[PDB]
């Protein structure tokens with residue numbers, strides 16, 4: 001819980017679902033009483049959508065009861081003014097979807113495998129804690145550190161918070177989030193379960209293999225609906241080394257989707 005007076009808003013970085021995102025600075029007393037001015041990620045709920053404030057905050061709160069090297073750090077909230085603001089660590093290299101687009105001509109199978117293994121590790125941690133994320137996608141993966149072939153250092157990613165839950169979002173927004181949202185949640189958003197994240201994880205691997213293309217982007221909401229109704233799978237990406245794993249995770253039967261331990265074992269065997 002942070003004071004408005006300790007936060008300075010700077011440039012807009014974009015928007016999420018019913019939110020606006022800004023780079024910012026938090027003035028804080030840190031360890032040993034040292035004063036720090038810390039770059040922060042600020043997510044502001046749209047005032048016009050103040051109805052979603054509880055879910056907006058339950059999303060960040062749920063994940064911050066657990067600590068983990070691959071889960072993004074949340075500093076707190078500022079409920080100052082009429083604004084609802086999430087204060088989050090600022091990651092140097094932004095989200096994975098934009099990173100994959102701007103760097104497509106420099107991302108090989110080894111880089112992808114390390115990113116997929118780290119994301120599976122985070123999801124395995126969540127599965128063991130029976131915590132549903134609900135919005136696994138490339139936009140919610142943050143790149144802390146780039147790969148450095150010189151020092152052999154692999155990339156390092158974190159999973160960000162899910163945003164407002166699909167269990168309260170309007171149906172046309174859910175439909176636009178096909179194929180990250182699983183078919184059982186399109187049928188009924190309250191079908192959100194651990195198996196939800198395995199499907200979305202599969203969709204996210206497709207993103208990682210497709211240079212930041214969005215799967216099914218050419219299809220409007222009604223065609224996305226019918227895609228599920230006809231039980232189609234995503235096309236294999238040209239870089240097809242993860243296609244079987246993608247299809248295994250994107251199983252129309254939720255009970256058949258493999259555990260993240262089995263997913264990690266599959267990744268390790270490639």
Ligand SMILES: N#Cc1ccc(Nc2nc(N)nc(Oc3cccc(C(=O)O)c3)n2)cc1
Nearest residue numbers: 013014021041089090091092093094095098
């Ligand atoms: N250029 C650049 C750049 C560099 C660093 C960040 N840092 C950061 N940090 C955190 N915790 N979360 C995010 O989410 C976002 C939100 C909006 C857009 C994007 C994106 O990739 O454009 C990412 N971004 C963001 C952008």
